[PDB]
């Protein structure tokens, strides 16, 4: 059987397709770049279903952001930040964060170019 | 047992700064950036071309990440200590943080150099290289180091 | 869209090969014999560009490179060439096996020393 449907030359696995985009985004363009393959940044849901994240080298976008005013971090899908998924840690003052392995958040500023990771589910 | 350690150094003394990164083997110095050049200091790293030229996109990057903001405090020293040891078969680490040469860990609320510099050296550093890395990196560099014809 | 493909349902799949990678250390023979109990072999390096992703792989790894103690060369458990300037090959341990890490480097390992491993299925 196949793992699908996905974009075309993405990582599939477990029902979720990916992409590593090596080009540096600030944040938003990330987000707009994903949305334009009618995708999202990366949503970390699941350490068993996504526990290939587990060996990714260097950091990336993924779609959690914090909104200053009720304190919390939230995936584009407005859904909260599940506990016991990802340890969070503070680097820079900032409202977004970096995906680091093993299941780490960096808090980044939006505005630092970095590379990222779209996903697509089904 | 053997160690390696990574030394990096930003000074700003007024107008000019100094970026520098020590590499020792075994509290030796093996290789050394300028800021802008890498280059070996012992015989056995003579010709390499897989830790230079890895070690000079890693330190480069270490310090164009790292947002220093300007100030009016004319003299600000950085020191980013950052060491692997492998004896017996276990790997462990040490890392140092120094503002103006004094060792320090913990981080204030102010928006400063000295606190930017503390939570973000070690995740400057470990974006292409984690510490299995620099075990790898260590066992590595013990081997050229062991059958050098010199 | 397209699908990806053919693969097993639990494993990667990337460019219609599959990968999993097994996070318990076992010697490279065990490794070997582990993904061959899966219709699958250890990791083969064969294209940067199809296996692209491989550079954003984290930890060190058995893959199926053999050393040749015969003409010192290396080749895959299935017999094939190692293509030229793919694999930066890296004395570390003596020994008769590699692991692979980032970037497309291969690090040589006592085979029997334990290691996590990555399987792969071509097709």
Redesign the interface.
């Given at each position: 059987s196949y793992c699908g449907p996905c974009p075309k030359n993405w990582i599939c696995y477990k029902n979720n397709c990916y992409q590593f985009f090596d080009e540096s985004k600030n944040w938003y363009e990330s987000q707009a770049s994903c949305m334009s393959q009618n995708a999202s940044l990366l949503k970390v849901y699941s350490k068993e279903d996504q526990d290939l994240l587990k060996l990714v080298?260097?950091?990336h976008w993924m779609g959690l952001v914090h909104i200053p005013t009720n304190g919390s971090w939230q995936w584009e899908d407005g859904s909260i930040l599940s506990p016991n998924l990802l340890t969070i840690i503070?680097?820079?003052?900032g409202d977004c964060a970096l995906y680091a392995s093993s299941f780490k958040g960096?808090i980044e500023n939006c505005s630092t170019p970095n590379t990222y990771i779209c996903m697509q589910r089904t | 047992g053997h160690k390696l350690a990574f030394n990096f150094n930003l000074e700003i003394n007024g107008s000019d700064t100094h970026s520098t990164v020590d590499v020792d083997l075994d509290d030796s110095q093996i290789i050394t950036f300028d800021g802008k050049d890498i280059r070996p200091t012992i015989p056995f790293m003579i010709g390499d071309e897989?830790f230079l030229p890895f070690y000079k996109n890693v330190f480069s990057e270490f310090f164009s990440l790292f947002?220093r903001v300007p100030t009016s405090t004319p003299y600000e020293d950085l020191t980013y200590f950052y060491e692997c040891d492998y004896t017996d078969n276990k790997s462990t680490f040490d890392q140092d943080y120094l503002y103006n040469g004094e060792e320090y860990t913990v981080?204030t609320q102010e928006?400063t150099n000295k606190n930017?510099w503390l939570?973000?050296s070690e995740?400057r550093l470990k974006?292409?290289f984690?510490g299995?890395?620099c075990i790898?990196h260590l066992?590595?560099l013990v081997?050229?180091m062991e059958?050098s014809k010199r």
């Open positions: 080298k260097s950091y503070e680097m820079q003052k960096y | 897989i947002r981080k928006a930017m939570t973000t995740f974006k292409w984690d299995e890395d790898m066992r590595s081997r050229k059958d």
